[PDB]
Design a protein around this ligand. Structure first.
Ligand SMILES: Nc1ncnc2c1ncn2[C@@H]1O[C@H](COP(=O)(O)OP(=O)(O)OP(=O)(O)O)[C@@H](O)[C@H]1O
Ligand SMILES: [Mn+2]
Ligand SMILES: [Mn+2]
Ligand SMILES: [Zn+2]
Lengths: 234, 248, 382, 251
């Protein structure tokens, strides 16, 4: 667990007690339902929403910035909980869509929490390459970035970091001619970067959920997990 | 030329007593009695058909390694007709080129490759199902029962009036039916559609068995049976369902 | 055009002794670094009477020579590198035979400039109007060279009414259909058909691609538009330009156009009025947005979208004769792109006369030289 | 003598032979010595309960998703691309469905000889039985055409569509008490027979427009039912008589 954000694409292979299994499943279901209700009632960006979700995560001890406690407990809890919920929700298309929506909201929130200085390593730790441009390069190509920039008003190129990414990873972004390209690499701001990140994460999650849905019949045989996983959310 | 047509109902085959012959029973109309009577026709010379799928490139059969030459259809034909023929004692076969499709579970089979179609009389021994060749990849149709061959090749779809041309009358009876007929080749019989099924005879029987007093052996003591000679197969069930019966 | 009664013989001659088999194999094999890459390529042949076959393929250069001489295909096109040999496409499972890789191909036609042409029309071409393609090539080449950084671009004359571009970079050959569609969208600005009178619209901010296209066009606009076509000759000519201009100034423009005498001063006065015509009353912004829209609409390249969208879409091969004109698809030299002349392109009849009167003995030597330079760059990159 | 596998296998053999295929060799060993179930809401229901016969579900799945030996790329498989032309097995399943539909049309038109009406009914029943047993022909170890991946995919899709139907009808303000790929008991909470019939028609119509080739129908109505297990219940079968009146047959 190198990083707090993480992409869930490596199932764990540890052994946990049944009580721990149930507690993790219930805690993560509670977190997801709280995320959904909080997003519905409030707006996804208001400081109130972020503070309330911070409090929920603290009380459910699911994630936190790096420290001694974070290294061991919250990150493993998040991992195994996410995969147990994968088992629970891959049964039906509606459940899959709901899980995807709420997991996307949670990932977006966690990304917003993440301080900028670390994003680089996370992108490196995500196992896909995004490169940040230098201050000299940013100064040199500020005019080009502003000219190619979206309807974003003014020439102000603030402190938002700019990254060098292959045009392939920004298909939906550069296809509209709303970004600057150089030698096949696109220069994008932070908001579009997080959009791309969540889109790719959604694709990965959809594929993983389809695979788990196919694999369910092998694992449904267990009798001490059927009554829990069948109706974990329902 | 004399030809007769009859409504076939069931067919019997045996691979040991009369290999390569399919017996086919049914009802044949007779004008003399202006009715329908039992009949049986035996079809002979139902030739086994096998399909040899050839390898695209010759490989040593001892080890499967490369030989160094491609595989042509004539090459596989020659290889078969010499070595497989001598090995499995076949004196007469009509090998031909054919193009057939395969879309089933057998691994490593081209969908639409070329095949060697070997048609030879069923009297000769059947080849093993796992026969493998130096030139040919593998053979299908090794153990296809003659009844299936007759049904598929003649496009017979369940009980339907069949008309046989050149009916030869066998010297000695082979069945208990009132009429018998002969067919040298399966192709001599064709299928005619625009006819209605004839009524048949239905017998409903019931008997009472009893365990022998001494030691556990069933013993039949009483029999009863109802008969209906002219039973319609398309109209409503006749009422009464019978016109005669016997008990003992 | 070209006489078809003489096409077979000449084509025979052509297909016997003028196609660059060695260089063609080298190109389409791209160094032979991928197994069955040459064997898996799809080739398409359009024979006499427009009957065309698909999923054709070959084993090696000798096999290609044998089959191509045996048939003498009237038109040859290249396809995608499929999972298996296209020739045996029938012997593959339904759905398992799918296109896997193809080069990125762009296609520019002159018919699309019918709405933007006066001298010639349809496939008719004259030196005055051909400049369009030149400019187009320049722009697109720059756009591919700088913005996307594709190094191995082969530009070929379509033969009759346009050009083709092949991009053969190893990464480019693996792009999916969606990425190709996105690239086409990026390299396309003229949106809308004949139904819309104003076919170009620019946002407030000028994209650096758009700015560089404007800079390139400013170099050639005067020669192409203001003298050869006389688009501002009289009312019958400048009415078309006025149509895509706001009516509020039309009268004045008409007056000036009626009081003006040539295209240059009308250009200057239109520039002045645009710099004094308040596009948006809120702000005091003035720009050539009308002028630059006119320039781009009259000059900006237009691309065939469906041709490039498909991974399996086929395109005419280089050095292939055009059935409806007899012209040979010849690589267009970038360094001489301005001096290139489609009319001087030596026809199959002309190269045959030069022959009947090795490729270096004919006028295909320079075109083959450009092609070989492209192949040598490809090999050097390896 | 029994066994739908024989008749359906012969149907497949005829179809393949007429289409010039190499049908798999008859098994040599031979010697045949012979989905998802919703947990039932056991209890007492005094409101009208209706049965939706999920018959011909698997044939409908095959027709919809063009599952065939010539389409699915086995090596769990993946759904065939919709653009691909219809396979063989969907082809004759469709043929059976269309001829059943035409026979039903023939039944609809009146002024027919009662014997001919009985003949049409018999033909329709036979076609329905054959269509139902098609899948059993496809997926069974003892069968000639045993294709494990195809059977697994068909069962998976059937379970998916059944679960979707359950959740949808739940969203319709109803509640489903049982169903396994061949029937669905729906509790209507309605004491009006006509209301129940129209509600059943509406659910059938919406599921049909969601799945084009699925042909659902109403099999029976229970005025009051005590459910305990599969084929374990006590009900008042609602036999509809004329003028909208019904008899509560004790079953
Ligand atoms: N109906 C079509 N079928 C197959 N391919 C087509 C068809 N129409 C166009 N194409 C391809 O798309 C291209 C676009 O049409 P167009 O003929 O104008 O291109 P071009 O080669 O530049 O024209 P020309 O051959 O007259 O110089 C064609 O050259 C041709 O390669
Ligand atoms: Mn073209
Ligand atoms: Mn075209
Ligand atoms: Zn011209």
């Amino acid at each position: 667990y190198p990083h707090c954000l993480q992409f869930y694409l490596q199932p764990p292979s540890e052994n946990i007690s049944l009580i721990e299994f149930e507690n993790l499943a219930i805690d993560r279901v509670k977190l997801l339902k709280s995320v959904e209700n909080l997003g519905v009632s409030y707006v996804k960006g208001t400081e109130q929403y972020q503070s309330k979700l911070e409090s929920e995560l603290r009380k459910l001890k699911f994630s936190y910035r790096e420290n001694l406690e974070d290294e061991y407990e919250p990150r493993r809890r998040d991992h195994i909980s996410h995969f147990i919920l994968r088992l629970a929700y891959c049964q039906s298309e509606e459940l899959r869509r709901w899980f995807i929506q709420q997991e996307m909201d949670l990932l977006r929130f966690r990304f917003s929490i993440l301080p900028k200085d670390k994003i680089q390593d996370f992108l490196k730790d995500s196992q896909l390459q995004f490169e940040a441009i230098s201050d000299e390069e940013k100064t040199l190509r500020e005019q080009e970035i502003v000219a190619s920039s979206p309807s974003l008003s003014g020439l102000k190129l603030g402190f938002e970091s700019i990254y060098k990414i292959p045009f392939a990873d920004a298909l939906d972004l550069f296809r509209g001619r709303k970004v600057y390209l150089e030698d096949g690499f696109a220069y994008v701001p932070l908001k579009d970067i997080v959009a791309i990140i969540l889109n790719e994460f959604r694709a990965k999650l959809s594929k993983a959920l389809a695979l788990t849905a196919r694999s369910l019949p092998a694992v449904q045989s267990d009798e001490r997990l059927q009554p829990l996983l069948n109706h974990l959310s329902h | 030329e004399q030809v007769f047509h009859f409504y076939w109902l069931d067919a019997y085959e045996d691979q040991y007593n009369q290999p390569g012959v399919v017996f086919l029973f049914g009802k044949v109309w007779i004008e003399s009695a202006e009715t329908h009577v039992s009949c049986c026709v035996m079809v002979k010379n139902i030739e086994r058909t096998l399909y040899f799928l050839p390898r695209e490139m010759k490989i040593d059969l001892n080890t499967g390694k490369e030989t160094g030459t491609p595989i042509s259809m004539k090459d596989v034909y020659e290889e078969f007709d010499e070595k497989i023929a001598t090995k499995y004692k076949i004196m007469k076969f009509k090998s031909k080129p054919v193009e057939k499709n395969y879309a089933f579970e057998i691994p490593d089979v081209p969908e639409k490759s070329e095949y060697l179609e070997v048609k030879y009389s069923a009297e000769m021994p059947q080849l093993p199902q796992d026969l493998k060749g130096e030139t040919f990849s593998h053979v299908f149709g090794t153990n296809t029962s003659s009844l299936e061959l007759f049904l598929m090749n003649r496009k017979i779809k369940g009980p339907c009036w069949l008309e046989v041309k050149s009916p030869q009358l066998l010297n000695q009876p082979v069945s208990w039916c009132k009429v018998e007929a002969m067919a040298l080749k399966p192709d001599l019989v064709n299928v005619i559609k625009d006819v209605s099924p004839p009524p048949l005879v239905v017998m409903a029987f019931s008997m009472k068995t009893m365990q022998n007093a001494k030691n556990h052996q069933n013993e039949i003591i009483a029999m009863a049976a109802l008969v209906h000679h002219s039973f319609a197969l398309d109209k409503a069930a006749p009422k009464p369902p019978f016109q005669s019966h016997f008990c003992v | 055009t070209f006489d078809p009664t003489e096409l077979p013989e000449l084509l025979k001659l052509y297909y016997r002794r003028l196609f660059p088999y060695s260089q063609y194999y080298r190109w389409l094999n791209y160094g032979g670094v991928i197994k069955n890459y040459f064997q898996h390529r799809e080739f398409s042949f359009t024979l006499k009477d427009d009957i065309y076959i698909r999923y054709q393929s070959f084993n090696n250069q000798s096999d290609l020579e044998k089959e191509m001489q045996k048939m003498n295909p009237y038109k040859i096109d290249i396809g995608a590198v499929y999972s298996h040999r296209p020739n045996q496409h029938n012997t593959v499972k339904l759905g398992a035979f799918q296109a896997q890789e193809k080069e990125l191909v762009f296609d520019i036609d002159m018919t699309d400039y019918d709405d933007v042409r006066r001298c010639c029309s349809s496939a008719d071409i004259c030196p005055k109007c051909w400049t369009l393609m030149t400019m187009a090539i320049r722009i697109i080449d720059r756009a591919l060279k700088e913005d996307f950084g594709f190094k191995h671009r082969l530009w070929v004359y379509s033969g009759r009414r346009g050009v083709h571009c092949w991009v053969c970079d190893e990464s480019v050959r693996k792009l999916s259909s969606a990425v190709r569609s996105g690239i086409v969208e990026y390299l396309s600005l003229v949106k809308g058909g004949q139904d819309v009178k104003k076919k170009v619209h620019l946002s407030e901010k000028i994209h650096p691609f758009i700015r560089k296209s404007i800079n390139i066009i400013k170099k050639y606009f005067e020669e192409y538009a203001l003298v050869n076509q006389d688009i501002l000759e009289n009312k019958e000519s400048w009415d078309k330009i006025l149509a895509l201009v706001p009516e509020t100034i039309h009268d004045e423009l008409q007056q000036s156009f009626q009081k003006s005498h040539n295209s240059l001063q009308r250009w200057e006065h239109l520039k002045k009025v645009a710099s004094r015509y308040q596009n948006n009353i809120k702000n005091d912004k003035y720009g050539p947005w009308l002028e630059w829209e006119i320039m781009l609409q009259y000059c900006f390249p237009r691309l065939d979208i469906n041709v490039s969208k498909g991974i399996n879409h086929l395109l005419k091969s280089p050095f292939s004769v055009h059935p409806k004109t007899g012209r040979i698809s010849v690589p267009i030299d970038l360094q001489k792109v301005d001096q290139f002349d489609p009319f001087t392109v030596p026809t199959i009849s002309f190269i045959c006369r030069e022959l009947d009167a090795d490729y270096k003995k004919t006028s295909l030597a320079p075109y083959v030289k450009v092609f070989e330079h492209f192949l040598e760059n490809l090999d050097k990159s390896r | 003598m029994g066994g739908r596998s024989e008749r359906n296998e012969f149907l497949l053999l005829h179809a393949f032979y007429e289409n010039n295929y190499i049908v798999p060799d008859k098994q040599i060993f031979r010697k045949p010595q012979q989905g998802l179930v919703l947990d039932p809401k056991v209890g007492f229901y005094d409101k009208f309960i209706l049965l939706l016969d999920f018959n011909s579900l698997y044939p409908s799945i095959i027709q919809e998703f063009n599952i065939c030996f010539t389409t699915v790329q086995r090596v769990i498989p993946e759904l065939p691309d919709p653009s691909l032309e219809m396979g063989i097995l969907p082809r004759e399943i469709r043929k059976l469905v269309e001829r059943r539909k035409q026979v039903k049309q023939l039944m609809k038109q009146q002024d027919l000889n009662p014997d001919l009406i009985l003949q049409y009914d018999i033909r329709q029943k036979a076609l329905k039985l054959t269509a139902n047993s098609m899948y059993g022909c496809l997926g069974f170890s003892y069968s000639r055409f045993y294709a494990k991946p195809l059977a697994a995919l068909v069962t998976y899709k059937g379970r998916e569509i059944l679960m979707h139907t359950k959740e949808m009808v739940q969203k319709m303000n109803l509640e489903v008490i049982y169903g396994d790929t061949d029937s669905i008991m729906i509790n209507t909470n309605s004491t009006n027979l006509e209301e129940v019939f129209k509600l059943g028609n509406k659910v059938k119509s919406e599921v049909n427009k969601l799945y084009k080739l699925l042909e659902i129908d109403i099999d029976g109505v229970f005025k009051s039912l005590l459910l305990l297990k599969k084929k374990k219940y006590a009900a008042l079968v609602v036999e509809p008589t004329s003028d909208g009146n019904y008899v509560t047959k004790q079953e």
